Write a protein that binds this ligand. Structure first.
Ligand SMILES: C[C@@H]1CC[C@@]2(OC1)O[C@H]1[C@@H](O)[C@H]3[C@@H]4CC[C@H]5C[C@@H](O[C@@H]6O[C@H](CO)[C@H](O[C@@H]7O[C@H](CO)[C@@H](O)[C@H](O[C@@H]8OC[C@@H](O)[C@H](O)[C@H]8O)[C@H]7O[C@@H]7O[C@H](CO)[C@H](O)[C@H](O[C@@H]8O[C@H](CO)[C@@H](O)[C@H](O)[C@H]8O)[C@H]7O)[C@H](O)[C@H]6O)[C@H](O)C[C@]5(C)[C@H]4CC[C@]3(C)[C@H]1[C@@H]2C
Ligand code: CLA
Ligand code: CLA
Ligand code: CLA
Ligand code: CLA
Ligand code: CLA
Ligand SMILES: CCCCCCCCCCCCCCCCCC(=O)OC[C@H](CO[C@@H]1O[C@H](CO)[C@H](O)[C@H](O)[C@H]1O)OC(=O)CCCCCCCCCCCCCCCCC
Ligand SMILES: CC1=C(/C=C/C(C)=C/C=C/C(C)=C/C=C/C=C(C)/C=C/C=C(C)/C=C/C2=C(C)CCCC2(C)C)C(C)(C)CCC1
Ligand SMILES: CC1=C(/C=C/C(C)=C/C=C/C(C)=C/C=C/C=C(C)/C=C/C=C(C)/C=C/C2=C(C)CCCC2(C)C)C(C)(C)CCC1
Ligand SMILES: CC1=C(/C=C/C(C)=C\C=C\C(C)=C\C=C\C=C(C)\C=C\C=C(C)\C=C\C2=C(C)CCCC2(C)C)C(C)(C)CCC1
Ligand code: SF4
Ligand code: SF4
Lengths: 134, 167, 80, 33, 154
């Protein structure tokens, strides 16, 4: 992970003890212009001219921030998951294409070929460990 | 125009000097360095308290902690408790104060046996505090709290009861 | 944690994947020769049960469902 | 016989809660059960 | 119904036998969680809790049955007599500690190795705590019994 931290004085809302112990997140993006943007949790900050990086508590804050970056026309937002051992994984886009646009490499999962009304009654699957939706 | 209006932008102005800073150098962190949190006076006081003092054994910490609390808890039970207007008013405070120390020591050893997660680090105390990160350290702390707490309450009882003779 | 089940009545609106805050959903190509696409739920551990997708799906009854289940730190949205 | 109430009332109000809550707390916080 | 008594572990070759008194659920907890076997304590804390229990125990026989029991200084004799006995008990630990004591044994009720009593340091720290807690337990029992009339008089 390489990038400049946005310039902000600091805030009570932000990283907490969970970050050291459990899966802190980090978002990365490149800017064309230095602009003022609202942080995910309180306040405002100034992004640098290129290769910004911000450490984040939850994945929801990063994607919520990405929607704000799209207002500034920045679509190269990347999110990572940082475990305490330092393992960093390219978490949000697994492949370069975004989730909205289809790609051949992906595969359907948890697809129920039946209609929703065709689900079985729960009495038929009691005392079996099965669930109706499965 | 007054010069105070012109100097508002300059950094030489006493206004523009900022007292508050981000926790450490990382601004992403939760805390904020403040004169209450990160002053040299407060840092010295908190870091040198028995819970944070360097080079002390866990038993010595609880004794210093217990002797304070035992000496403190005698007051409310004596003057404001029941039987406050009676010959045995001060005696009731000694028993009630020791009662909390037993209950307090129970919670300590009880919290100890349940695996305590950690002792956290903050701006006021940057290093990890002590060996309070294990059952062995917390258990010795509990036994020390009991001894000091019983002693501190007795001291407040001796001084308070025999205050007229001291005068 | 949770379980997001996607049923046969999808039509490829792409509204569910957009409304998701945690990126639990994804639009994948369907083996249907004349079916353009279909949704998916590959990373279900990050579901936060906010039911925004259920509000977005325009079928008469929802092709997508979010069944609540065993909770965790990620599902409960605990930054601490 | 009235002295029994002087011994049974406090243990019900103090000893039994302390024993139950102390066991239950350590039981629920146990890692393996 | 079927058999209740079993051999110690899987091996019947060994001496000990698993019995209700030896290997019941209740007895295993009490003995293993007594201070002499409780996990997560240092040698000092074990001796303190043990002595505190014994000083409180040993005060009684000297006071209510020793000489001068029917006198004004009865309860005082129990405190001094108990402390003298605790000191001898403390001295015995130092000798057993300073004589290279072999080992502590593991039985069925305490299956794991009992504690770090496998050295001179563990027993010496045990002895220092016995005197501190031992004298404390006796002093406590003295003030209660001497002032029991007041505590009830409240
Ligand atoms: C009733 C009173 C009156 C007087 C007084 O007692 C109580 O005795 C005092 C004493 O001696 C203290 C001073 C001791 C020295 C201290 C020194 C300390 O300086 C330090 O500064 C650092 C720089 O990074 C290091 O970190 C660090 O580790 C370190 O020590 C500073 O943080 C405050 C401190 C100056 C003190 C503050 C408070 C006092 C004046 C105490 C105090 C009010
Ligand atoms: C149901 C059981 C129960 C019982 C038996 C008691 C009994 C008592 N409570 Mg109590 N209490 C209870 C439940 C109970 N409480 C609950 C649930 C609450 C929460 C609302 C309270 C809240 C409460 C308050 C807020 C107060 C009491 C007080 C008292 C005492 C007042 C007696 C008196 O007239 O003046 C006093 C008469 C005396 C003879 C002096 C009493 C001296 C104490 C009780 C000696 C205790 C020594 C103790 C055993 C040491 C413990 C260590 C040991 C565990 C090893 C009395 C002993 C009052 C008090 O101050 O007691 C000191 C008081 O202020 N209680
Ligand atoms: C409601 C709570 C309460 C009560 C009733 C008392 C009562 C008492 N405290 Mg006390 N104290 C308290 C809270 C309390 N304190 C707190 C919060 C602290 C820590 C900050 C202390 C620290 C403390 C010390 C260090 C000493 C006492 C002493 C005394 C006794 C004075 C002797 C006497 O009987 O004179 C008659 C008493 C009165 C007419 C009323 C109380 C007057 C005292 C002097 C008040 C002192 C506390 C202070 C004002 C609290 C504010 C602290 C805050 C700014 C942080 C008295 C029994 C002294 C003692 O042991 O007695 C020999 C002593 O050396 N206390
Ligand atoms: C099961 C219903 C029941 C209830 C609600 C009570 C209620 C009471 N009893 Mg009591 N008692 C009961 C059955 C019950 N008793 C039985 C069956 C016996 C004969 C063994 C007694 C013998 C007894 C004595 C000798 C005394 C009381 C006293 C008391 C009072 C003080 C608190 C207490 O429980 O003491 C503690 C009481 C006990 C430990 C005995 C209860 C034994 C039963 C079988 C356990 C019930 C289990 C319960 C359902 C578990 C639910 C959780 C209170 C009014 C005291 C009193 O008079 O104070 C004013 C007192 O001195 N009780
Ligand atoms: C002949 C032996 C003997 C004698 C004279 C006494 C005498 C006494 N014991 Mg005692 N006690 C004994 C054996 C004895 N006990 C044994 C064998 C045990 C353990 C099984 C205890 C456990 C014990 C406890 C737990 C307490 C007493 C208390 C008391 C005192 C009552 C006040 C009295 C001095 C009480 C005490 O200290 O008085 C306040 C008290 O709380 N004893
Ligand atoms: C072996 C039998 C025996 C018994 C029972 C006693 C009993 C007594 N003697 Mg004595 N005596 C004996 C033999 C005995 N003597 C002999 C053989 C001699 C000749 C040398 C003497 C010479 C003698 C003298 C010269 C004096 C006494 C005195 C006394 C009294 C005080 C005891 C005391 O302070 O000890 C304190 C005892 C202890 C600190 C230890 C007590 C051990 C407890 C009871 C153990 C209990 C174990 C428990 C139940 C099990 C726990 C189970 C667990 C799982 C919970 C008491 C009545 C004194 C007195 O004046 O008499 C009135 C006195 O001055 N004795
Ligand atoms: C002693 C009374 C208890 C008793 O009989 O033994 C206690 C035994 C318990 O016997 C149980 O037997 C089971 C058989 O599958 C298993 O072997 C259990 O281990 C064994 O405990 O009680 C009986 O089984 C017979 C009880 C008949 C009592 C009638 C009471 C009439 C009044
Ligand atoms: C100003 C100020 C302040 C205040 C302070 C205070 C008020 C204090 C406290 C006080 C206290 C709280 C004190 C106490 C003390 C106590 C003592 C003095 C104790 C004693 C003890 C003893 C001596 C004991 C002993 C013993 C033992 C241990 C055992 C045996 C017995 C005997 C008894 C021997 C503060 C910090 C807040 C803040 C800042 C400023
Ligand atoms: C039922 C039963 C039983 C019984 C039991 C018993 C009988 C008990 C014992 C008892 C005892 C044996 C008790 C004791 C206790 C003691 C105590 C209570 C102590 C105290 C202490 C203290 C408190 C101290 C403190 C101090 C110190 C340490 C130092 C300084 C000083 C002072 C004082 C502060 C048995 C188990 C057998 C078996 C089973 C069942
Ligand atoms: C529980 C238990 C057990 C059992 C036990 C029994 C059952 C019994 C014992 C017994 C014993 C072990 C006893 C002891 C006793 C002793 C005595 C009897 C002594 C006395 C002494 C005297 C009387 C002296 C006094 C004095 C002093 C100390 C000093 C100064 C001088 C004079 C002379 C004053 C066992 C071991 C198995 C294990 C653990 C637990
Ligand atoms: S029907 Fe629902 S799941 Fe299917 S594409 Fe439209 S919004 Fe997505
Ligand atoms: S509850 Fe709905 S919107 Fe929220 S993560 Fe799950 S599928 Fe997406």
């Amino acid at each position: 992970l390489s990038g400049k931290t946005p310039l902000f004085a600091g805030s009570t809302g932000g990283l907490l003890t969970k970050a050291v112990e459990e899966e802190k997140y980090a978002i990365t993006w490149t800017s064309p212009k230095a602009q003022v943007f609202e942080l995910p949790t309180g306040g405002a900050a100034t992004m640098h001219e290129g290769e910004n990086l911000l450490y984040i508590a939850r994945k929801e804050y990063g994607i919520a921030l990405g929607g704000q970056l799209r207002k500034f026309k920045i679509t190269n937002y990347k999110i990572y998951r940082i475990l305490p051992s330092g393992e960093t994984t390219f978490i949000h886009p697994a492949d370069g294409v975004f989730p909205e646009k289809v790609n051949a490499g992906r595969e359907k999962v948890r697809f129920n070929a039946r209609s929703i009304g065709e689900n079985p009654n729960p009495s038929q699957v009691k005392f079996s460990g099965k669930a109706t939706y499965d | 125009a007054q010069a105070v209006d012109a100097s508002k932008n300059l950094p030489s102005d006493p206004r523009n000097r900022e007292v508050v800073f981000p926790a450490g150098r990382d601004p992403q962190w939760g805390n904020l360095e403040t004169p209450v949190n990160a002053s040299p006076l407060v840092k010295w006081f908190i870091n040198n308290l028995p819970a944070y003092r360097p080079g002390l054994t866990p038993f010595r910490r609880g004794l210093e902690v217990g002797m304070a609390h035992g000496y403190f808890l005698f007051g409310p039970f004596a003057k404001l408790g029941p039987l406050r207007d009676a010959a045995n008013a001060n005696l009731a405070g000694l028993l009630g104060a020791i009662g909390l120390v037993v209950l307090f020591t129970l919670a300590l050893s009880l919290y100890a046996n349940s695996n305590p997660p950690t002792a956290l680090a903050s701006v006021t105390v940057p290093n990890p505090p002590d060996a309070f990160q294990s059952k062995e350290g917390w258990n010795n702390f509990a036994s020390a709290f009991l001894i000091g707490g019983i002693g501190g309450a007795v001291v407040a009882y001796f001084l308070t009861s025999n205050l007229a003779l001291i005068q | 944690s949770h379980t997001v089940k996607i049923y046969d009545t999808c039509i490829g609106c792409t509204q569910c994947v957009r409304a998701c805050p945690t990126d639990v959903l994804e639009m994948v190509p369907w083996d249907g020769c004349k079916a353009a696409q279909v949704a998916s739920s590959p990373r279900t551990e990050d579901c936060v049960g906010c039911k925004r997708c259920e509000t977005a799906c325009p079928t008469d009854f929802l092709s997508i469902r979010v069944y609540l289940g065993a909770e965790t730190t990620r599902s409960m949205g605990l930054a601490y | 016989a009235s002295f029994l109430s002087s011994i049974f009332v406090p243990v019900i109000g103090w000893v039994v809660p302390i024993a139950t809550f102390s066991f239950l707390f350590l039981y629920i916080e146990r890692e393996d059960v």
